[PDB]
Symmetry: C5
Subunit: 237 residues, 5 copies
């Protein structure tokens, strides 16, 4: 009955809110020293990316939920844990308050193939916007995904796939499975150069039976790509 | 599935004033920080006057917040830049974040907003007035988010289009009967925030908020399918109300 | 269809004893003096008929105090709240919950005016909770026909009548104003009457099937003397 | 309809060890002495029959301690709470949960057995269990829409289970409709903590709870007398 | 109708902590060392209790913001468990270990299936049963913890089911778990009366993806598909003394 999956990089979505009042009290010398240390940390992460042992990206997040997200991908939970712990021990991380996080593993569902590695070990596209949200499938009375027969689930997933293929080109998706790893069953990351495409695809999916009847959603997070010019501007008072 | 036209990107930024910290400042430094905020708001007025956005400030009743800063911009980048520049104001250390909402001004296709044809609606001046709304200086504001239910037999997203259209039509008739008393901005937020719409109402009589929201609750579109978040009510704040508000 | 009266704020506060204790007694006295001035101001608004207010001490950790204020506009209620938060002593009164509503009755008449603009009875105890009516499957209040709801409300009213002289109720409507649909304030000189009336109503179909309840807060009347004792540390 | 006895406060606290640790031992001793005089005053009220109180240490992070106090009026209970909060040591006792209720006897005052139940002596049992609960009002599972006779039968079967734990678990049922966020506060006392798991599991398979019970958080702990109270606070 | 009966072993604490890096960074290295020395002394005391057979314990570093560390401790009484918790909180270093979540439970073996022959024997004298009630913790690379309860929701009400139907549902769930022998080791802690859910579930594995595999497969089995209500999930990596010293080095 059960889905069987292929699993790739382990993923951390780390959402932080900047403690502006504390940061403002820091002398501008201390601020520069802490950003220099962060900049070294990010150069090391870029090395890991260039040799193909992981990926990462940073977006600034709208609204009060976060000021930024660090999305990091590694080939083991141990390497992910070490990134996280080294990040938290940066001086600047004392000013980066934790507001939400998500742990997942890039997932390919069965519903060395170079076309599989590309999905399992995704290079992150440098699109202007990111959207993240977690979700689960419902187990609620007669709307119970996990009691459906495989044939009916397969039909529902087929229809859902047709919609997303029509957004190829506009929206790039990474689906992280998180059963056993976090509080929902998937973490969904979307990338696009037009944020309205996130609204468009997620709305269209909500009227397809697989989501209309069976999706349960967490919080949504949207943001804008942060390279270094925007990162340094971000922190300048 | 519903199709939408989409206009300005919206931030409702709710803040609570840290009176105890503010009180610790001497009035000289308080004035300096208020001057910096006025300069900030003067810049926001320029953006408004060149047609690139809108903004307004209301004082909020109860402990949920003291103020809301409602800001509208033509891109997420611009909205993000306002937000970040605002948090970096000196006075913002005394404005504690208590809630926020991200949405985009939305016109659905459940009813027609213009004569059908190849003529594209973004060039229709009536449509543009709705997508890029002028904010009216009404005495009061009401904000809340909402979603449509997907709950057993009450599942909005499993209804056929013609049934959703009828439900929306009937909802619209009620709202139309509050013309001249309540003005509404509907921000779509599927993909952007935790509910599916952020609803902003404006009126000179706060009791019209209770009236319309109650009346709609007995209409099937809301009675059967609405799920509501928290409600925020407040009073218009111009400069007079603002420096007054911060005089301790 | 409802008639609407005073706008209401229930403002729950927990006292920051650790910080209060750090103040020398002279500064404590100055802050209490300021608070008494503010409260005498509130009493003046009451005595000219432009509002009401009362203060109860709250049991349990949810709060130490509730300030229940009623005013004739949202602007006036906002000004009171803001002037309150600017008192020096308010820095020691940490906000733990609040509720916004308007007195509701479903205008020249004196018995109506007595309901819409209620005098607050000096009863020993208070009980506050918000509630809404369910929209949940077959238990959907707002999908009922008019005449079915009228019958359900009728029966709930008979119960209330039997508590005349035991419990006095103020019902604030809050659709459009806060997170639930009504704020319910009860006053009695016997706190057990709160339990009795609210239990009795819970077996009546209007509440048994359709009520959704928030948190409950219960308290004891604070006059000037009990206020000074409260803060003596 | 019910009979109602003492008003009850369950007051859960976590100790601020970092701040307590900053105090020199003489000041720590002065604050504990003040708490000792407060508890000896509480013992006078207990000895005269005007209330009761006990203290248990609580397992896990929800609390370090529970102060469970019973008084014959809401005013007396409020006065205990406020005096407690104004103890110097209370700055180090952070409030993490509380519950207000009244000892309850349903019909599903001069009698000596009735009075022993309304105004209960707290047994010095090794362990305590506290949890609040309400009866469901959810579609076909609606306790408050049941006919009186069906409810009487469901309570009867529930009481049969409780009777079989006589001598193992002692229970205090506090009504809280009108007073706190659930409908009852349930306090269990036993010398064997597994009896809590046994009685609560067995009740959960009895229809009255299987269909109709809605539970809040559960707290368990160990009796703290004077001996153990001093060691709790010794760093 | 017929309630489950259980055998119950060690009382358990799952104690999740987040490290207050900002505060820890402000200590000079000499004082950090003293605090880590004291912690090592407390852990060697834990080890002594393990090595005389009166309890167990283990430490994992947790991924994500929910915690940096979990301390999982097992003891033969609630008093001993409470004493360990209180001594831990009074360590100097514990000021830097902020509480983010905890769970209290007791190692549970129910009677849905047999764990030993019904020949009249004391199950607590059966060494196989004892190995389960007083489990030695395996030094597997990864841990997974989550609490869960069984639904009492309309037509999906576990506690209204007949014994023989619950037994069938448990039986089928067990066959799935049996298929993960050698890949996932489970400890089931019962928590009815002790904490906010009905069980705490701890999984150990050298491959974290086996957690995802077993929990996903059980979620398509009726016992969980229809009746499970889950709390939060925590996953982590084994921490021995060496990884502990690295964790706290800035
Ligand atoms: C966005 C978004 C969501 C979450 C929102 C919602 O669920 O409402 C979303 C949700 C899910 C979820 C769960 C699953 C897994 C469900 C399960 O395993 O039971 C899940 C699984 C699949 N998705 Fe999915 N998605 N999705 C896209 C975007 C979104 N998708 C785009 C775009 C494409 C197309 C691009 C591509 O395939 O490379 C796409 C295609 C697939 C295919 C391939 C189908 C096919 O080949 O026909 C599978 C399998
Ligand atoms: C207030 C309020 C709420 C939220 C509370 C509740 O819905 O219970 C409220 C909620 C919503 C929600 C969601 C939606 C989007 C639903 C969807 O796209 O599924 C949503 C969408 C629409 N509303 Fe709405 N509303 N609303 C008014 C006030 C409120 N409205 C007033 C006033 C007018 C009248 C404007 C006028 O004067 O011409 C009005 C009209 C419309 C129209 C135009 C319909 C038509 O043309 O007939 C659309 C589309
Ligand atoms: C207590 C309590 C609650 C909340 C708990 C619950 O509803 O379970 C409570 C709740 C409500 C709620 C909502 C409503 C409005 C519901 C709606 O409009 O849909 C609501 C409305 C009414 N109540 Fe109510 N109550 N209530 C009393 C106490 C409580 N009442 C007592 C006492 C009296 C006795 C009357 C008196 O002597 O003054 C009494 C009477 C009325 C009347 C009488 C008709 C009239 O206003 O002309 C109306 C209408
Ligand atoms: C434990 C526990 C709970 C909460 C957990 C759950 O509900 O699953 C629990 C829950 C409740 C609740 C509510 C009520 C009231 C519900 C209502 O009035 O609607 C409630 C009410 C009663 N209980 Fe109850 N209980 N309970 C015991 C333990 C527990 N009890 C033990 C032990 C005895 C043994 C009695 C004795 O000491 O003489 C016992 C007996 C009674 C009687 C006895 C009446 C009679 O003598 O015929 C009444 C009435
Ligand atoms: C993983 C996981 C979960 C939680 C996730 C979920 O969806 O359930 C999980 C959840 C639970 C829960 C509650 C219960 C208690 C059910 C109840 O008493 O209502 C519960 C109870 C049992 N489990 Fe369970 N599990 N489980 C395994 C893994 C998981 N298990 C593995 C592996 C094995 C295989 C062991 C082996 O053969 O070596 C295994 C077997 C059993 C047996 C059979 C042995 C016995 O009599 O104790 C019982 C009973
Ligand atoms: Na932000
Ligand atoms: Na306010
Ligand atoms: Na209190
Ligand atoms: Na504890
Ligand atoms: Na972590």
């Amino acid at each position: 009955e059960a889905v069987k999956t292929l699993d790739g990089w382990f993923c951390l979505h780390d959402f932080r809110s900047i403690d502006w009042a504390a940061w403002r009290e820091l002398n501008p010398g201390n601020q520069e020293l802490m950003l220099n240390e962060l900049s070294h940390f990010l150069s090391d992460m870029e090395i890991t990316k260039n040799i193909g042992e992981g990926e990462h990206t940073i977006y600034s997040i709208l609204g009060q939920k976060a000021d930024l997200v660090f999305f990091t991908l590694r080939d083991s939970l141990e390497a992910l844990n070490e990134v996280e712990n080294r990040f938290n021990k940066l001086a600047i991380a004392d000013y980066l308050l934790p507001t939400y996080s998500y742990i997942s593993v890039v997932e390919l569902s069965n519903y060395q193939n170079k076309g599989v590695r590309a999905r399992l070990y995704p290079a992150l596209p440098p699109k202007k916007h990111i959207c993240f949200y977690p979700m689960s499938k419902k187990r609620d009375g007669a709307d119970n995904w996990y009691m459906l027969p495989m044939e009916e689930r397969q039909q529902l997933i087929r229809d859902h796939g047709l919609i997303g293929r029509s957004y190829a080109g506009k929206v790039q998706q990474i689906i992280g499975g998180s059963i056993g790893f976090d509080d929902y069953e998937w973490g969904v990351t979307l990338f696009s150069d037009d944020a309205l495409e996130f609204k468009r695809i997620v709305t269209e999916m909500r009227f397809d039976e697989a989501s209309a009847r069976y999706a349960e959603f967490g919080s949504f997070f949207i943001g804008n790509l942060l390279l270094s010019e925007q990162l340094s501007k971000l922190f300048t008072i």
